[PDB]
C-alpha cells in the first residue's frame, strides 16, 4: 500500500549544487553531475565513492548512462556534451554544435545515438561512435528542459520553457505530436512507452496517454515553480511516482490513486534530482547549493 523509504547513506563530495543523479542499468553504480564541473561515480548499494570524472570547462546539468553501463554522457554550460568511458574515466568524444548551455541528455536503448537539449532552443541527435551531429531539430522557442527516448528508440519526447511537449520521430527528426501553457520543466516516457510523465512549473506532474493525447493522472502536493526537477516511475515494488520538490522533500505518490504515500525529509535545499534503482527499492536524491549532497533511501516495498 505504502513504501517505507528510510535514509541509508549521505554522499558528500561535490563542491557546488548537484544537478542530476542516475543509476547505471546494471544497478551497480550511481553517477552524479554537478555545477562544480565534475561527474562522480558511487556504489549504488553502499554509497562508496569510486571516482571523479573531469574535463568539462563549466558546470554540468545532466548525466546519462548507456544501455550496457559502460559509457556516460554529460551536458554542460561549456556548450558541449562529453562521452566518457566509465572504467577509465577518459573522455572519448566531445560533441560540439550547440550554441548555448547543454541542459539535458540521454542515450537511446541501442546506445548508438545521444539526444540533447539546450538553451539554444534546439534538440540535437548525435552519433555515439563518431561524435558527429546527425540532426538538429528546431524543436522549441525557449530552452529545452528534457529529452528522452522511448523503449524501442523510435521516438524522442522533448519539453521546454515555451510550454510545449513534443514527440519526435528519431529516424526523420520530424514532429509526430505536440501536446494555460505553463513552462514544461521535465518529461520522460514511462517504462512501457505508453505514457509520458510531464512536470510543469505550476506545482503539477501529469501522466499523459501519448497516442490518445489525453491526461490520465495528475500528481500534486509538492512545490515546483522555479527549477527543472526530475521525476520518475518507481516499478521495483509498488507502482509509484517519485519527484523532488522546492520545499526540500522527496515526494512519492501512488501512481493509480494519485495519493501522496511518503515524503522523505533530510535535504536542506531544493531536491533537484531523484532516481529509482532498476532492481532494488532504492531512491537516490540530490540537492542544490545549500546542501550539495546525495542521499540513498531504501524501502521494503
Amino acid at each position: 500500500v505504502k513504501p517505507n523509504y528510510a535514509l541509508k547513506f549521505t554522499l558528500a563530495g561535490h563542491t557546488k549544487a548537484v544537478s542530476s543523479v542516475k543509476f547505471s542499468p546494471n544497478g551497480e553504480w550511481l553517477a552524479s553531475s554537478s555545477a562544480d564541473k565534475l561527474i562522480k561515480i558511487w556504489g549504488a548499494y553502499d554509497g562508496k565513492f569510486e571516482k571523479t570524472i573531469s574535463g568539462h570547462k563549466l558546470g554540468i546539468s545532466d548525466v546519462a548512462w548507456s544501455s550496457d553501463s559502460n559509457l556516460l554522457v554529460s551536458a554542460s554550460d561549456d556548450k558541449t556534451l562529453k562521452i566518457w568511458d566509465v572504467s577509465s574515466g577518459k573522455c572519448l568524444k566531445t560533441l560540439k554544435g550547440h550554441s548555448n548551455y547543454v541542459f539535458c541528455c540521454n542515450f537511446n536503448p541501442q546506445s548508438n545515438l545521444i539526444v540533447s537539449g539546450s538553451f539554444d532552443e534546439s534538440v540535437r541527435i548525435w552519433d555515439v561512435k563518431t561524435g558527429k551531429c546527425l540532426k538538429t531539430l528546431p524543436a522549441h522557442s525557449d530552452p529545452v528542459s528534457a529529452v528522452h527516448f522511448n523503449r524501442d528508440g523510435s521516438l524522442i519526447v522533448s519539453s521546454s520553457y515555451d510550454g510545449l511537449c513534443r514527440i519526435w520521430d528519431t529516424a526523420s527528426g520530424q514532429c509526430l505530436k505536440t501536446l494555460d501553457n505553463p513552462p514544461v520543466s521535465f518529461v520522460k516516457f514511462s517504462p512501457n512507452g505508453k505514457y509520458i510523465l510531464a512536470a510543469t512549473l505550476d506545482n503539477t506532474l501529469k501522466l499523459w496517454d501519448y497516442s490518445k493525447g489525453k491526461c490520465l493522472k495528475t500528481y500534486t502536493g509538492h512545490k515546483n515553480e522555479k527549477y527543472c526537477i526530475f521525476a520518475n516511475f518507481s516499478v521495483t515494488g509498488g507502482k509509484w511516482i517519485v519527484s523532488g520538490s522546492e520545499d526540500n522533500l522527496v515526494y512519492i505518490w501512488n501512481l493509480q490513486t494519485k495519493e501522496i504515500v511518503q515524503k522523505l525529509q533530510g535535504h536542506t535545499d531544493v531536491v533537484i534530482s531523484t532516481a529509482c534503482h532498476p532492481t532494488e527499492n532504492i531512491i537516490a536524491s540530490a540537492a542544490l547549493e545549500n546542501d550539495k549532497t546525495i542521499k540513498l533511501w531504501k524501502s521494503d516495498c
Binding site: 546539468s61 530552452p143 527543472c228 542544490l288
Partner: peptide
C-alpha cells in the same frame, strides 16, 4: 545552469 532559477 539547472541550479539557477531562470526568469
Amino acid at each position: 545552469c539547472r541550479k539557477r532559477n531562470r526568469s
